Design an enzyme around this catalytic site. Sequence first.
Site, PDB file in Angstrom:
ATOM      1  N   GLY A 238      -0.848   1.593  -3.686  1.00  0.00           N
ATOM      2  CA  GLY A 238      -1.976   0.747  -3.164  1.00  0.00           C
ATOM      3  C   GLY A 238      -3.225   0.574  -4.109  1.00  0.00           C
TER       4      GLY A 238
ATOM      5  N   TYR B  36      -0.784  22.503   1.395  1.00  0.00           N
ATOM      6  CA  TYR B  36      -1.470  23.226   2.674  1.00  0.00           C
ATOM      7  C   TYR B  36      -0.113  23.524   3.320  1.00  0.00           C
ATOM      8  CZ  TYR B  36       0.249  18.357   4.075  1.00  0.00           C
ATOM      9  OH  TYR B  36       0.963  17.359   4.290  1.00  0.00           O
TER      10      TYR B  36
ATOM     11  N   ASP C 204      -2.302  13.410   6.452  1.00  0.00           N
ATOM     12  CA  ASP C 204      -0.642  13.229   6.278  1.00  0.00           C
ATOM     13  C   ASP C 204       0.067  13.408   7.530  1.00  0.00           C
ATOM     14  OD1 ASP C 204      -1.099  13.178   3.253  1.00  0.00           O
ATOM     15  OD2 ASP C 204      -0.035  15.035   3.226  1.00  0.00           O
TER      16      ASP C 204
ATOM     17  N   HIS D  94      -3.515   5.539   5.473  1.00  0.00           N
ATOM     18  CA  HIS D  94      -3.352   6.811   4.663  1.00  0.00           C
ATOM     19  C   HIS D  94      -4.100   6.870   3.387  1.00  0.00           C
ATOM     20  CE1 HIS D  94      -0.837   9.757   2.566  1.00  0.00           C
ATOM     21  NE2 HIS D  94      -1.201  10.306   3.609  1.00  0.00           N
ATOM     22  N   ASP D  95      -4.055   5.695   2.552  1.00  0.00           N
ATOM     23  CA  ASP D  95      -4.736   5.778   1.355  1.00  0.00           C
ATOM     24  C   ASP D  95      -6.171   5.806   1.677  1.00  0.00           C
ATOM     25  OD1 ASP D  95      -2.548   5.304  -0.335  1.00  0.00           O
ATOM     26  OD2 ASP D  95      -2.808   3.013  -0.285  1.00  0.00           O
TER      27      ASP D  95
ATOM     28  N   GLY E  35       2.332   3.726  -1.803  1.00  0.00           N
ATOM     29  CA  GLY E  35       2.929   4.225  -3.124  1.00  0.00           C
ATOM     30  C   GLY E  35       2.150   3.654  -4.329  1.00  0.00           C
TER      31      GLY E  35
ATOM     32  N   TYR F 226       0.569  -1.138  -0.238  1.00  0.00           N
ATOM     33  CA  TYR F 226       0.245   0.057   0.063  1.00  0.00           C
ATOM     34  C   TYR F 226       0.684   1.232   0.116  1.00  0.00           C
ATOM     35  CZ  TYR F 226      -4.338  -2.553   0.398  1.00  0.00           C
ATOM     36  OH  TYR F 226      -5.610  -3.370  -0.120  1.00  0.00           O
TER      37      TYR F 226
ATOM     38  N   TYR G   2      -7.198   9.263   2.214  1.00  0.00           N
ATOM     39  CA  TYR G   2      -7.443  10.314   1.093  1.00  0.00           C
ATOM     40  C   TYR G   2      -8.817   9.869   0.408  1.00  0.00           C
ATOM     41  CZ  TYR G   2      -2.614  12.064   0.672  1.00  0.00           C
ATOM     42  OH  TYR G   2      -1.423  12.685   0.818  1.00  0.00           O
TER      43      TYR G   2
END
Lengths: 121, 4
Positions: free
Chosen positions: A31, A64, A89, A47-48, A29, A27, A51
């Site tokens: 995923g 950001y 993040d 994290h995926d 990079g 996952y 998003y």
Amino acid sequence: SLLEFGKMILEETGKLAIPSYSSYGCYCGWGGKGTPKDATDRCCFVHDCCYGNLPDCNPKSDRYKYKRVNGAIVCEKGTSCENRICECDKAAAICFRQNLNTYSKKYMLYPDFLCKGELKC
Amino acid sequence: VIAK
């Protein structure tokens, strides 16, 4: 954006996001499938998935701003997408630091066919 | 620098 997540990774773990985290496990990079192979790979999975809850934002390219109070990551105000991309993040970087001690080199450039199964967010 |  990727420019901030990577600088955040580097600040946090000491390691460069590319190559340490650009092609790790199933996952980190790229995923899409499989069972995450470890703590670091699970961080990327969450994290995926983070998003994923923002279908109308653009994580890779929307910038950001964040600051450090002491060691702490604090996301500055921006658009709602930016605050929420920043929160996902921040989580990943903490997650990466908290599992540095099990980071394994054998999961670098992990082959795709060894990633089998859907796992739900 | 990072990821997909």
